């Protein structure tokens, strides 16, 4: 039996709304550690790593390590039905091929029960070693979404280069060229100016904006997004989940 009670149900809703546009089906792994997920898109160009640590759940019950294969869109359609104020509970009896989503109001005057069928999924899991990236860029999530959306209206590829002069985002297309340079302010005196740019060694890589724009679906999860880059590795775009975990997007470069 599996019973995970999460007080802030809006998180799970925002988490599923994120991953669903990049991945159709994936396994949710439940362990003593927590609720996790790892999957690549159909092309194997991008990868998504999700973690909702056990500490975040007001109640975490997991007798044995298990995996639940799921149609992310379907689970998302179901979670869309819970009120942002609702207390969501994931229940699963290892002996059945169904998972149960309970949605309870704070007052308990409304209790919803959403049963869904699981599915056998044989997904490929990659071993991702930790590494100190050459350049780390922290900026307002809304601004990152802005840059990707804007630049994609101009071209399809974005060259993200980090030097001593800041981080440049450039693209070219049929109508012309466009680049956007962000630099740290004298001080971080407001959210907008919360741009931190760590740069141990200069980096410059090119990526498909279509994928970057898919990662931005996670925007509502946090006000900040962290971008990690190394000259010989896929970029990392991370959004913290509240304070109990995260969603990490990996995107192979164009070389």
């Amino acid at each position: 039996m599996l019973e995970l009670r999460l007080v802030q149900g809006s998180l799970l809703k925002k988490v599923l709304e994120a991953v669903k546009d990049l991945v159709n089906d994936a396994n949710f792994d439940c362990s003593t550690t927590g609720f996790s997920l790892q999957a690549m898109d159909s092309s194997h160009v991008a990868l998504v790593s999700l973690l909702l640590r056990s500490e975040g759940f007001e109640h975490y019950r997991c007798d044995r390590n298990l995996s639940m294969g799921m149609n992310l869109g379907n689970m998302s359609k179901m979670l869309k039905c819970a009120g942002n104020d609702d207390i969501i509970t994931i229940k699963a009896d290892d002996g059945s091929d169904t998972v149960t989503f309970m949605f309870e109001s704070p007052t308990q005057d409304k209790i919803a029960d959403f049963e869904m069928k699981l599915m056998d999924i044989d997904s490929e899991h990659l071993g991702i070693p930790d590494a100190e990236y050459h350049s780390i860029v922290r900026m307002p999530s809304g601004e990152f979404s802005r840059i990707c959306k804007d630049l994609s209206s101009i071209g399809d590829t974005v060259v993200i280069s980090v030097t001593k002069e800041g981080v440049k985002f450039s693209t070219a297309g049929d109508i012309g060229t466009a680049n956007i340079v962000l630099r740290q302010n004298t001080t971080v005196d407001k959210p907008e100016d919360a741009i931190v740019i760590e740069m141990n060694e200069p980096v410059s890589l090119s990526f498909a904006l279509r994928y970057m724009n898919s990662f931005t679906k996670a925007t509502p999860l946090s006000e900040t997004v962290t971008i990690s880059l190394s000259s010989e590795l896929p970029v990392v775009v991370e959004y913290k989940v509240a304070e109990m975990g995260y969603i990490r997007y990996y995107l192979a470069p164009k070389i």
Binding site: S43, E124, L126
Partner: peptide, 11 residues
């Protein structure tokens, strides 16, 4: 040319 995640990490 677009590379793949598998070009850097493995199962």
């Amino acid at each position: 040319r677009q590379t793949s995640m598998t070009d850097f990490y493995h199962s």
